[PDB]
Amino acid sequence: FDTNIVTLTRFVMEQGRKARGTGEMTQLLNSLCTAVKAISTAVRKAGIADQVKKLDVLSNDLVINVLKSSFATCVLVTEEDKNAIIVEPEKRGKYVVCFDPLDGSSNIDCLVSIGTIFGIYRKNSTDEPSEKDALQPGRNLVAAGYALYGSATMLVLAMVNGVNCFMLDPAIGEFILVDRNVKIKKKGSIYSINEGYAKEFDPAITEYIQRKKFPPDNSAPYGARYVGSMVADVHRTLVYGGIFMYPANKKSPKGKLRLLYECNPMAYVMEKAGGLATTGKEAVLDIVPTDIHQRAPIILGSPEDVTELLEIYQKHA
Amino acid sequence: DTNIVTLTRFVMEQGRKARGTGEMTQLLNSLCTAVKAISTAVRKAGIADQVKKLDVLSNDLVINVLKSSFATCVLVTEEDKNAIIVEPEKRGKYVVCFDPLDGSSNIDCLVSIGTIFGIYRKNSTDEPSEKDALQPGRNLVAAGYALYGSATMLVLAMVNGVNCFMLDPAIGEFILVDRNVKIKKKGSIYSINEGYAKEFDPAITEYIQRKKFPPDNSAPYGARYVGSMVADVHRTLVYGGIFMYPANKKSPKGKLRLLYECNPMAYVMEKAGGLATTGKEAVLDIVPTDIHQRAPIILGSPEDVTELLEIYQKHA
Amino acid sequence: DTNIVTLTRFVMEQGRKARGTGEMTQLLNSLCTAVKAISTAVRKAGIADQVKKLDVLSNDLVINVLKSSFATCVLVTEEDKNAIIVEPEKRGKYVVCFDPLDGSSNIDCLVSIGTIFGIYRKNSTDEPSEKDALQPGRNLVAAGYALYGSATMLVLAMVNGVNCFMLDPAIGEFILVDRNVKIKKKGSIYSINEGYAKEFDPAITEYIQRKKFPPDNSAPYGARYVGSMVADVHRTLVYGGIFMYPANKKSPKGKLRLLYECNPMAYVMEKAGGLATTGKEAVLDIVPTDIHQRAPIILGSPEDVTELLEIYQKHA
Amino acid sequence: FDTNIVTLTRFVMEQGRKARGTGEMTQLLNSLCTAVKAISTAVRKAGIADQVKKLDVLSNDLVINVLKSSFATCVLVTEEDKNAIIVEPEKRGKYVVCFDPLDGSSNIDCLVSIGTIFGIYRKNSTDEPSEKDALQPGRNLVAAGYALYGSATMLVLAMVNGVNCFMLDPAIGEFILVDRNVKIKKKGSIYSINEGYAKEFDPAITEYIQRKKFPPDNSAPYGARYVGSMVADVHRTLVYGGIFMYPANKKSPKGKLRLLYECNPMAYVMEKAGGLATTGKEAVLDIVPTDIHQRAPIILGSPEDVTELLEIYQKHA
Numbered sequence A, D: 001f002d003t004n005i006v007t008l009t010r011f012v013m014e015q016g017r018k019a020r021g022t023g024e025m026t027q028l029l030n031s032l033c034t035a036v037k038a039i040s041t042a043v044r045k046a047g048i049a050d051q052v053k054k055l056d057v058l059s060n061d062l063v064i065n066v067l068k069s070s071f072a073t074c075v076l077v078t079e080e081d082k083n084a085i086i087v088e089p090e091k092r093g094k095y096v097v098c099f100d101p102l103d104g105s106s107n108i109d110c111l112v113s114i115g116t117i118f119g120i121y122r123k124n125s126t127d128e129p130s131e132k133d134a135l136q137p138g139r140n141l142v143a144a145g146y147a148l149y150g151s152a153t154m155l156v157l158a159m160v161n162g163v164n165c166f167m168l169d170p171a172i173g174e175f176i177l178v179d180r181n182v183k184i185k186k187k188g189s190i191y192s193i194n195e196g197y198a199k200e201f202d203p204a205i206t207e208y209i210q211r212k213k214f215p216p217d218n219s220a221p222y223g224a225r226y227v228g229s230m231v232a233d234v235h236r237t238l239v240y241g242g243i244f245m246y247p248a249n250k251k252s253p254k255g256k257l258r259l260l261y262e263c264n265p266m267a268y269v270m271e272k273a274g275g276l277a278t279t280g281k282e283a284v285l286d287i288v289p290t291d292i293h294q295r296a297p298i299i300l301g302s303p304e305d306v307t308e309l310l311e312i313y314q315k316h317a
Numbered sequence B, C: 001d002t003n004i005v006t007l008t009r010f011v012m013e014q015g016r017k018a019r020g021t022g023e024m025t026q027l028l029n030s031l032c033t034a035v036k037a038i039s040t041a042v043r044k045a046g047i048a049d050q051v052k053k054l055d056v057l058s059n060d061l062v063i064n065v066l067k068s069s070f071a072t073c074v075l076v077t078e079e080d081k082n083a084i085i086v087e088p089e090k091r092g093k094y095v096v097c098f099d100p101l102d103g104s105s106n107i108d109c110l111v112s113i114g115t116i117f118g119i120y121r122k123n124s125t126d127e128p129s130e131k132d133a134l135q136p137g138r139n140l141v142a143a144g145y146a147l148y149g150s151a152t153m154l155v156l157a158m159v160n161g162v163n164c165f166m167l168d169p170a171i172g173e174f175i176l177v178d179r180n181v182k183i184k185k186k187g188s189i190y191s192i193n194e195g196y197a198k199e200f201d202p203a204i205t206e207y208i209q210r211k212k213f214p215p216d217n218s219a220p221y222g223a224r225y226v227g228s229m230v231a232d233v234h235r236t237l238v239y240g241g242i243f244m245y246p247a248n249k250k251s252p253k254g255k256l257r258l259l260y261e262c263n264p265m266a267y268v269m270e271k272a273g274g275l276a277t278t279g280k281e282a283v284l285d286i287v288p289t290d291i292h293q294r295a296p297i298i299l300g301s302p303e304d305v306t307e308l309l310e311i312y313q314k315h316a
């Protein structure tokens, strides 16, 4: 065994001491890591012990209980809960966490990789905590990230500093630092979008896809890749580069993905890694929320690529 | 639980019915040991290249476990130029063609990857040679894949059906979770790498158009393409749909190798009630002339593969 | 590592040499599945009685895995009054006497406990009965124990020797770590429950005195007594020494049952070069008349057991 | 899975918030738990990957690195290091940990259970930290305990509050609370001592052993049990009751076991569980240390039993 392992907790702490900051954040993310290991083990034995609905409810309960017990949060927004959860006085701390407990729970049946997505805001107001504290623009995130439960469990953490990847060591139950200051490729070679929705795409998306399939400058076309699980397609976009798109369509006129705990965590991870995240109009990280479960279009990925689609959005405006 | 049905118990009970020798049980028992080790390697593949090196170790491990089973005589690998002829001391009756880690490139993006295998019976009486591997997929005795994803799954197809076994990590034992899987007749998803749109033959090109913009105004299809044959085929099995990797002209014979990628997947599909075609003939009836031969493959739910076959008729 | 010697590979290669049927490999493969499950149960036995309930589940699990191996016909358990006769559908040639979780009381103090087993071959032609289990330990075909301690260890004794296999938890596979273990001729430790000092027969009483206060002024012995036969016997095997559980008058026949505690441990010892005696005869040559019969046992390094035998002579 | 797991970290924190105390202790014990899981996995695969010496050196390095990185310690005493380790200024915190990294490393070859023992002192002086801070009497321990690597890994933690047992869940890598406020049986029925040393025992020990083997009041004798691994025999004494004795003998005139990190951690655990720990003369927890690797006789266990031996020590004085 290595006698000098850089666990997530140690990393956060060495960076925290460096800024003589918070402390509470380490109790927060450590509790989150317990929930994440418990959900990873549960997914890994999923069919031996439904998935779509039930396992996600159990994940929701576990992430809420551990976050309340970290003594680091005051307001919690979940995909599952209609209203925001306010923590008991004696257990309160300074943070607002917005989380999706199990993105894609349906996908378990098909053994498609899925994940946990989270956003961490610092409660800025001096008032009694309320869902109002959750409605900050994405640019206000203190920390955000995701856990991908795939062939290995990866926890990706973006903080002010940049993006750091951690992998769960199954043997000792610790997320270990494996990639240190991640920056996405300036342009990529893959585009990820559900083309079953082609009949309802806006002219800008449509022009871009055919420009990737039939490249104007008589170059090689882009490869398509679409796992159908946001955490899987954004993690591939981050490591390999390219662009991931979930624009608006018929049944999803304002996009499908929820702004506070899917779009904004991924957008903060993506911009801290040097990439871009836009609606096609504004940058996702500037949208002041209205409803905790508000939806947004998201286009994220390699800077050169997102820019090409923004230029095409300018043309048809 | 007290009475657990493991892959060994299942294959042994089945094997008894054949009044056989025990060699197939020896073989799949060995294979499971390799599958568990590759699973642990990929589960911590990152705590430290992992494409060339991990597919090499995966390949050496599978050949070693198969040779020691006393069940094999010819072994064909994605990784090896020629067939491996098992030493006389260790020889048995089965031929195994396998891809040890399909899509090993994908490990960096944590994409589910897996091991694919097809098992034949050597029927002839002369020395083992790669010609014993050159049989049509119609003659596979057993075939399957192990998926290294959020859970490790072994899907096994034999004459009596398709069954799914999940690796219980606590006891390191594959437990039977799904018995005689049948695919649904029609599905909602089409998988293909549409980035090759310029190169598609017009029959493919028409069908894709038809799935996005339905003529009978029916609901359009969802598109899913993990980029890993085991993950795309496994979803097609569980959820129904159609998976396609036809000739993309750059690959005029298709990309996927016949003996260890197309034929195992095709045997699984047919045993589950799906179809597998090149668009011109059923892949299980192609007679191989080279152990590393490629084929185009279109497989999945019957109605959807039939629909594409009709569009192929109408393109003359 | 690419070529790993598992318990299955080892037993299969050995079995080939006997020109046998595969049943012993079937049997020990099944047994390993039970041993891995009991190991995981004890490793989290506490995260929640665990004596009566855990020894019951351990017993049901072992009987289930043995019946499905198609290798057994009579099964004798510490937990069951009568022998279990395997159904005709599932019968094979071996008789198995086993203690499923020896010292299950000890789990609360996290004392290492384990499974002990002795395997006979039914030689007669009439219906299986518990009389096929009533053979001398000299006739065991194989015997051993699995120790659930800081690591799970399977010590296996057969005609060719004693070998030790460690459970690798990552791949759930018993790996050969020690080959043909031999015990050292003389050791430094004596194990006995000295709390019974009033009840010891004067030969035991003299030897203990002699080990604490050496007449030839030699260094005294260390005393170790875990209170668990598998842990005490395993240390005696690895480190040398003498382990004793003679008649403590309250138990005038000794405590430990002959067929599934004394005889497996004694076969292991003799195969490793040690001795096992009641103080009056070798336990492996005792002819059993009841499947739940007890014996006194003194086993360990040859010189030390011989020394105690001489003191037994001198007590007339 | 349980959606409300009481991990060691959560427990310590709910008790810590209750006293609005330290914080640093949670970073300390959390780091210690990482080291303990890594040593548990290493012991569990010990013969597949010598034991006596080497694995204990690697354990020593790992416990030192994680304690330095918890930003909670200033002085560390180890069995392995001749002098005490002083932490770097930027990494210092208020605690002194005295630890035995792998008690009984020899015993691995025989698969005898072994453990990690630790004592946690708060640096009381205002001076620059030095080994002088480690030399406090045992009564000054803030927290002490042990990890037993046996058929299961158990972490036992005694703090001001009492004794709490935690068990490592192999599946998620978390010590889970399994026994909550442990108190030892007033009298027991087992005595644990290496009787190979009989030739050199003092008359008090000698009289007591024969009184356990031949009970004066014509009762049933005591059972003997001696694993030869302090952590195993003290853990059995704690759960089952009885008395564990390592008095002085010929090669060990002041006892064998080291005072700061074997005797005092076990003595604090034992007295917080209602038992006693004595030299035969003074209580172990009152001995002011002199040398960091000073030795002590220890007799610990059920109150009624230790008292009987102390009465016998009075008689021959």
Ligand SMILES: O=P(O)(O)OC[C@H]1O[C@@](O)(COP(=O)(O)O)[C@@H](O)[C@@H]1O
Binding pocket: A223, B101, B102, B103, B104, B105, B106, B193, B227, B228, B229, B230, B232, B255, B256
């Ligand atoms: O991205 P395209 O060119 O469609 O290829 C992906 C296919 O290639 C694969 O063979 C994976 O490639 P490798 O197995 O050669 O690593 C198959 O598993 C995928 O479906």
Ligand SMILES: O=P(O)(O)OC[C@H]1O[C@@](O)(COP(=O)(O)O)[C@@H](O)[C@@H]1O
Binding pocket: C101, C102, C103, C104, C105, C106, C193, C227, C228, C229, C230, C232, C255, C256, D223
């Ligand atoms: O404490 P004493 O009476 O010597 O008995 C301990 C012996 O009993 C045991 O049979 C354990 O008891 P159980 O197996 O009946 O639980 C054997 O494993 C021990 O060596």
Ligand SMILES: O=P(O)(O)OC[C@H]1O[C@](O)(COP(=O)(O)O)[C@@H](O)[C@@H]1O
Binding pocket: A103, A104, A105, A106, A194, A228, A229, A230, A231, A246, A256, B222
């Ligand atoms: O089939 P579609 O609409 O492309 O869905 C893909 C998107 O839907 C999601 O699976 C949402 O999942 P759920 O709706 O079950 O929460 C995302 O993870 C993913 O990006």
Ligand SMILES: O=P(O)(O)OC[C@H]1O[C@](O)(COP(=O)(O)O)[C@@H](O)[C@@H]1O
Binding pocket: C222, D103, D104, D105, D106, D194, D228, D229, D230, D231, D246, D256
């Ligand atoms: O054989 P003995 O002297 O009774 O030794 C037992 C004592 O020695 C120890 O094993 C000490 O171990 P080490 O000397 O290897 O550090 C204690 O754990 C135990 O209580």
